[PDB]
Design an enzyme around this catalytic site. Structure first.
Site, mmCIF file in Angstrom:
data_model
loop_
_atom_site.group_PDB
_atom_site.id
_atom_site.type_symbol
_atom_site.label_atom_id
_atom_site.label_comp_id
_atom_site.label_asym_id
_atom_site.label_seq_id
_atom_site.Cartn_x
_atom_site.Cartn_y
_atom_site.Cartn_z
ATOM 1 N N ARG A 158 24.719 -43.869 11.443
ATOM 2 C CA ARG A 158 26.267 -43.647 10.665
ATOM 3 C C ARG A 158 26.342 -45.506 9.946
ATOM 4 N NH1 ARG A 158 26.924 -40.375 15.403
ATOM 5 N NH2 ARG A 158 26.372 -38.071 14.422
ATOM 6 N N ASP A 167 26.343 -48.236 1.582
ATOM 7 C CA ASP A 167 27.631 -47.089 3.148
ATOM 8 C C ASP A 167 28.876 -47.772 2.896
ATOM 9 O OD1 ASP A 167 25.745 -45.666 5.002
ATOM 10 O OD2 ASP A 167 27.221 -47.107 6.450
ATOM 11 N N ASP A 197 26.388 -34.200 1.124
ATOM 12 C CA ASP A 197 25.009 -34.759 1.010
ATOM 13 C C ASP A 197 25.287 -36.208 2.117
ATOM 14 O OD1 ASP A 197 22.861 -35.683 -0.180
ATOM 15 O OD2 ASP A 197 24.276 -37.626 -0.337
ATOM 16 N N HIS A 201 24.977 -38.931 8.470
ATOM 17 C CA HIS A 201 24.904 -40.871 8.225
ATOM 18 C C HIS A 201 26.347 -41.113 7.560
ATOM 19 C CE1 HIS A 201 20.883 -41.123 7.549
ATOM 20 N NE2 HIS A 201 21.014 -39.812 7.043
ATOM 21 N N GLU A 233 24.990 -31.048 5.042
ATOM 22 C CA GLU A 233 23.460 -31.514 4.813
ATOM 23 C C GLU A 233 22.996 -32.232 6.570
ATOM 24 O OE1 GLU A 233 21.416 -34.311 4.039
ATOM 25 O OE2 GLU A 233 19.563 -33.611 3.837
ATOM 26 N N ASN A 298 14.319 -27.002 -0.004
ATOM 27 C CA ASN A 298 15.695 -27.526 -0.871
ATOM 28 C C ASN A 298 14.846 -28.301 -1.108
ATOM 29 O OD1 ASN A 298 14.727 -29.597 1.124
ATOM 30 N ND2 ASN A 298 17.076 -30.066 1.133
ATOM 31 N N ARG A 337 20.620 -19.216 1.030
ATOM 32 C CA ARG A 337 20.843 -20.259 0.167
ATOM 33 C C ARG A 337 19.046 -19.972 -1.373
ATOM 34 N NH1 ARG A 337 21.775 -26.689 0.120
ATOM 35 N NH2 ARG A 337 19.534 -26.178 1.332
HETATM 36 C C1 LIG Z 1 17.443 -46.951 -2.907
HETATM 37 C C2 LIG Z 1 16.420 -46.052 -2.942
HETATM 38 O O1 LIG Z 1 16.234 -45.323 -3.520
HETATM 39 C C3 LIG Z 1 16.094 -43.998 -3.678
HETATM 40 O O2 LIG Z 1 16.229 -43.303 -2.669
HETATM 41 C C4 LIG Z 1 16.803 -41.860 -3.109
HETATM 42 C C5 LIG Z 1 15.444 -41.155 -1.696
HETATM 43 O O3 LIG Z 1 14.077 -41.137 -2.302
HETATM 44 C C6 LIG Z 1 15.646 -39.324 -2.384
HETATM 45 O O4 LIG Z 1 15.123 -38.486 -1.272
HETATM 46 C C7 LIG Z 1 17.331 -39.404 -2.788
HETATM 47 O O5 LIG Z 1 18.308 -38.625 -1.034
HETATM 48 C C8 LIG Z 1 19.474 -38.271 -0.858
HETATM 49 C C9 LIG Z 1 19.907 -38.879 -0.377
HETATM 50 C C10 LIG Z 1 20.626 -39.606 0.024
HETATM 51 O O6 LIG Z 1 21.527 -40.317 -1.027
HETATM 52 C C11 LIG Z 1 20.583 -38.009 1.109
HETATM 53 C C12 LIG Z 1 19.372 -36.410 0.846
HETATM 54 N N1 LIG Z 1 19.019 -36.140 1.705
HETATM 55 C C13 LIG Z 1 17.958 -37.831 2.660
HETATM 56 C C14 LIG Z 1 18.833 -37.366 4.716
HETATM 57 O O7 LIG Z 1 20.340 -36.970 4.191
HETATM 58 C C15 LIG Z 1 18.719 -38.278 5.284
HETATM 59 O O8 LIG Z 1 18.892 -37.543 6.575
HETATM 60 C C16 LIG Z 1 16.854 -38.518 5.038
HETATM 61 O O9 LIG Z 1 17.142 -37.523 6.085
HETATM 62 C C17 LIG Z 1 15.742 -38.114 7.527
HETATM 63 C C18 LIG Z 1 16.528 -37.152 8.852
HETATM 64 O O10 LIG Z 1 17.978 -37.130 9.247
HETATM 65 C C19 LIG Z 1 15.294 -37.584 10.137
HETATM 66 O O11 LIG Z 1 15.499 -37.176 11.009
HETATM 67 C C20 LIG Z 1 14.139 -37.665 9.551
HETATM 68 O O12 LIG Z 1 13.468 -35.981 9.715
HETATM 69 C C21 LIG Z 1 12.355 -36.010 10.549
HETATM 70 C C22 LIG Z 1 12.544 -34.810 11.377
HETATM 71 O O13 LIG Z 1 13.966 -35.535 12.186
HETATM 72 C C23 LIG Z 1 11.715 -34.883 12.548
HETATM 73 O O14 LIG Z 1 11.739 -34.176 13.550
HETATM 74 C C24 LIG Z 1 11.059 -33.747 11.605
HETATM 75 O O15 LIG Z 1 9.206 -34.436 12.438
HETATM 76 O O16 LIG Z 1 9.699 -35.058 10.716
HETATM 77 C C25 LIG Z 1 11.009 -35.591 9.742
HETATM 78 C C26 LIG Z 1 10.681 -36.533 8.798
HETATM 79 O O17 LIG Z 1 10.607 -37.406 9.221
HETATM 80 O O18 LIG Z 1 13.120 -38.074 8.417
HETATM 81 C C27 LIG Z 1 14.396 -37.758 7.156
HETATM 82 C C28 LIG Z 1 13.676 -38.020 5.944
HETATM 83 O O19 LIG Z 1 13.291 -39.891 6.004
HETATM 84 O O20 LIG Z 1 16.398 -37.970 4.271
HETATM 85 C C29 LIG Z 1 16.611 -37.208 3.229
HETATM 86 C C30 LIG Z 1 15.901 -37.471 1.837
HETATM 87 C C31 LIG Z 1 19.812 -35.542 -0.007
HETATM 88 O O21 LIG Z 1 19.361 -33.953 -0.235
HETATM 89 C C32 LIG Z 1 18.194 -36.645 -0.891
HETATM 90 O O22 LIG Z 1 17.896 -35.702 -1.789
HETATM 91 O O23 LIG Z 1 17.952 -40.132 -2.927
HETATM 92 C C33 LIG Z 1 17.342 -41.808 -2.584
HETATM 93 C C34 LIG Z 1 18.481 -42.964 -3.664
HETATM 94 O O24 LIG Z 1 18.344 -42.128 -4.935
HETATM 95 C C35 LIG Z 1 14.403 -44.322 -3.502
HETATM 96 O O25 LIG Z 1 13.107 -43.149 -2.822
HETATM 97 C C36 LIG Z 1 14.600 -45.836 -2.266
HETATM 98 O O26 LIG Z 1 12.866 -46.334 -2.441
HETATM 99 C C37 LIG Z 1 15.305 -46.814 -2.633
HETATM 100 N N2 LIG Z 1 15.214 -47.567 -1.733
HETATM 101 CA CA LIG Z 2 26.870 -44.664 6.297
HETATM 102 CL CL LIG Z 3 20.226 -28.628 1.534
#
Ligand SMILES: C[C@H]1O[C@H](O[C@H]2[C@H](O)[C@@H](O)[C@@H](O[C@@H]3C(CO)=C[C@H](N[C@H]4[C@H](O)[C@@H](O)[C@@H](O[C@H]5[C@H](O)[C@@H](O)[C@@H](O[C@H]6[C@H](O)[C@@H](O)[C@H](O)O[C@@H]6CO)O[C@@H]5CO)O[C@@H]4C)[C@H](O)[C@H]3O)O[C@@H]2CO)[C@H](O)[C@@H](O)[C@@H]1N
Ligand SMILES: [Ca+2]
Ligand SMILES: [Cl-]
Ligand SMILES: OC[C@H]1O[C@@H](O[C@H]2[C@H](O)[C@@H](O)[C@@H](O)O[C@@H]2CO)[C@H](O)[C@@H](O)[C@@H]1O
Ligand SMILES: OC[C@H]1O[C@H](O[C@H]2[C@H](O)[C@@H](O)[C@@H](O)O[C@@H]2CO)[C@H](O)[C@@H](O)[C@@H]1O
Ligand SMILES: OC[C@H]1O[C@@H](O)[C@H](O)[C@@H](O)[C@@H]1O
Length: 496
Positions: A158, A167, A197, A201, A233, A298, A337
């Site tokens: 968070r 953040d 979105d 977090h 999300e 998605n 969706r």
């Molecule tokens: C500055 C940076 O810019 C870029 O970053 C990009 C990014 O690459 C894009 O994907 C996109 O991200 C969007 C965002 C951010 O605004 C949010 C949305 N989706 C994201 C989720 O909100 C977030 O929570 C995260 O998901 C995690 C998840 O929370 C976590 O549990 C874990 O999931 C596990 C799961 O729990 C486990 O049971 C299973 O086995 O495996 C899963 C995978 O590990 O991991 C996920 C992923 O890490 O991430 C989501 C992407 C929205 O839908 C996205 O489109 O935009 C940003 C900003 O431009 C660059 O890429 C970066 O490198 C820079 N540093």
């Molecule tokens: Ca936050």
């Molecule tokens: Cl979504």
């Protein structure tokens, strides 16, 4: 917050990923409205940072610099026009609300933004909002990196930076008010709801504080006292610190377990069989149906981001994708969706798509128009899954059977299954490596029905398979394991 607010009878939403406002407006009038689609989820309409390395990735739109409605999708006038035109034809608009953060902290200071606003992420200054250093969580985050190091610590998730994104300090009323001001402007324009979105977090309470400041929906199209539809999300596949249930009080939540499990089952991985789907829904440990927003894939997981992994089915696996989408649209669980994507050049290196950053079809950074072909498909590399007969006809199926209970389940104990919805529809799948030739109880009244997967009901005839149902509701289904689409679906309105 749980009611989609779609026109009565419309049961689905479509994500028109990276589409331009003008193209969506047209799509509403020429297709979405007539075809019974409930609404459209648009890409972030607020100004974002311009990323040149890589060249204009789709993800730059998730790095806000201000709340001006000015992006590669269009300006404010075009946005307003879209919302009005769609609303008039019964299609709702849902905005992807990026409110957890601003752009990447490492971005350079300047006016390299979609609308020309100035910002300086190094000094946390966003003049166009305005936001300043005191509006961020920097001093609150307890990690050395200042980023999220462990998802088992609800505090880091968070208070710290998600992939280096600045953040916002959401517990502060100033921040909450800037955000609600932005959202309220959209609502008044006519938007019906929002995809929040990165909800995971933010603390459920902060989101709530923001939502309580929201206006009732525009009475030109919605009844007085209507509250906006909210879907958060939150990726939770079980076994992690933060749970989806923490956000139930704010509205609906994305059920990411849905697509991950369905993909594995349809692909037949890990010993999973389609007959295991008999108790699909809460029986598989999913959240309550009235709290879930479901989907097969998605914008993130269709290209490796987010959750799901390799099991996720996308347009790349067209044949199996349609079966999965068909099953979702026929099953009563959750609000659906449908995804609508664009094609890109995938390049796997060490089992990773290095080209996952590629943005929408474009002519030197300018998004290409969506062209429609004579056969109703799209050109310019827009995949347009929502236009594939098999998918558009199943969207209609869901509208038609709305409210009908899950009924008449049948399975061959392996990968051949079937079920109906009350007495308004029936669907049969053959995902086995052998023939399906059985006489099943459909629960439907006698008559001849057109199979909506292989064709359409055109006038007093069917263009594809016809299914003769006898007076006792029984019918024969013959599906070869080599059939282009190994499933058949019929309903009350495909009857001749
Ligand atoms: C500055 C940076 O810019 C870029 O970053 C990009 C990014 O690459 C894009 O994907 C996109 O991200 C969007 C965002 C951010 O605004 C949010 C949305 N989706 C994201 C989720 O909100 C977030 O929570 C995260 O998901 C995690 C998840 O929370 C976590 O549990 C874990 O999931 C596990 C799961 O729990 C486990 O049971 C299973 O086995 O495996 C899963 C995978 O590990 O991991 C996920 C992923 O890490 O991430 C989501 C992407 C929205 O839908 C996205 O489109 O935009 C940003 C900003 O431009 C660059 O890429 C970066 O490198 C820079 N540093
Ligand atoms: Ca936050
Ligand atoms: Cl979504
Ligand atoms: O009941 C909750 C669990 O359901 C599981 O789904 C399937 C399982 O994967 C199948 O192999 C088969 O046994 O049926 C189960 C449902 O009846 C799910 O995979 C688990 O994670 C849930 O906890
Ligand atoms: O309605 C347009 C078109 O939809 C379907 O075509 C899809 C096909 O089903 C998918 O497997 C994939 O290949 O994309 C196709 C084009 O979008 C119908 O099969 C087709 O007959 C119909 O014209
Ligand atoms: O024996 C079963 C069959 O009986 C006939 O009366 C019906 O017309 C068929 O549709 C049915 O499947």
């Amino acid at each position: 917050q749980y009611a989609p607010q779609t026109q009565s009878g419309r049961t689905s939403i479509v994500h028109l990923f990276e589409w331009r406002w003008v193209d969506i407006a047209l799509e509403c009038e020429r297709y979405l409205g007539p075809k019974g689609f409930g609404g459209v989820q648009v890409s972030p309409p607020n100004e974002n940072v311009v990323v040149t390395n890589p060249s204009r990735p789709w993800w730059e739109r998730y790095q806000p610099v201000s709340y001006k409605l000015c992006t590669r999708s269009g300006n404010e006038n075009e946005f307003r026009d879209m919302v009005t035109r769609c609303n008039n034809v019964g299609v709702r608009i849902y905005v992807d609300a990026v409110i957890n953060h601003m752009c990447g902290s490492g971005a350079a200071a300047g006016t390299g933004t979609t609308c020309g606003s100035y910002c300086n992420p190094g000094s946390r200054e966003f003049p166009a909002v305005p936001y300043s250093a005191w509006d961020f969580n920097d001093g609150k985050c307890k990690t050395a990196s200042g980023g999220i190091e462990s998802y088992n610590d609800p505090y880091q998730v968070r208070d710290c930076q998600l992939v280096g994104l600045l953040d916002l300090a959401l517990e502060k009323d100033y921040v909450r008010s800037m955000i609600a001001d932005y959202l309220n402007k959209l609502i008044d324009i006519g938007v019906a709801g929002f995809r929040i979105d990165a909800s995971k977090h933010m603390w459920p309470g902060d989101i709530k504080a923001v939502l309580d400041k929201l206006h009732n929906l525009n009475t030109n199209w919605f009844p007085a006292g209507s509250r906006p539809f909210i879907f958060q999300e939150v990726i939770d596949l079980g076994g992690e610190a933060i749970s989806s249930s923490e956000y139930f009080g704010n509205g609906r939540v994305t059920e990411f377990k849905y697509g991950a499990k369905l993909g594995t089952v349809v692909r037949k991985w890990s010993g999973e069989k389609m007959s295991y789907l008999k108790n699909w829904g809460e029986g598989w440990g999913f959240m309550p149906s009235d709290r879930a927003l479901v989907f097969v894939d998605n914008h993130d997981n269709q290209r490796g981001h987010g959750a799901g992994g390799s099991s996720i089915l996308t347009f790349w696996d067209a044949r199996l994708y349609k079966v999965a989408v068909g099953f979702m649209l026929a099953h009563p669980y959750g609000f659906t969706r449908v995804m609508s994507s664009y094609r890109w050049a995938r390049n796997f290196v060490n089992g990773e798509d290095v080209n996952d950053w590629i943005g929408p079809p474009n002519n030197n950074g300018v998004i290409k128009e969506v062209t429609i072909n004579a056969d109703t498909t799209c050109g310019n590399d827009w995949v347009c899954e929502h236009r594939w007969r098999e998918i558009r006809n199943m969207v209609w199926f869901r509208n038609v059977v709305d409210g009908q209970p899950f009924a008449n389940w049948w399975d061959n104990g392996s990968n051949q299954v079937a079920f109906g919805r009350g007495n308004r529809g029936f669907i049969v799948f053959n995902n086995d490596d052998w023939q399906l030739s059985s006489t099943l109880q459909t629960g439907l009244p006698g008559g001849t029905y057109c199979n909506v997967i292989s064709g359409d009901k055109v006038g007093n005839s069917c263009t594809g398979i016809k299914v003769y149902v006898s007076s006792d509701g029984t019918a024969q289904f013959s599906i070869s394991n080599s059939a282009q689409d190994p499933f058949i679906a019929i309903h009350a309105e495909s009857k001749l």
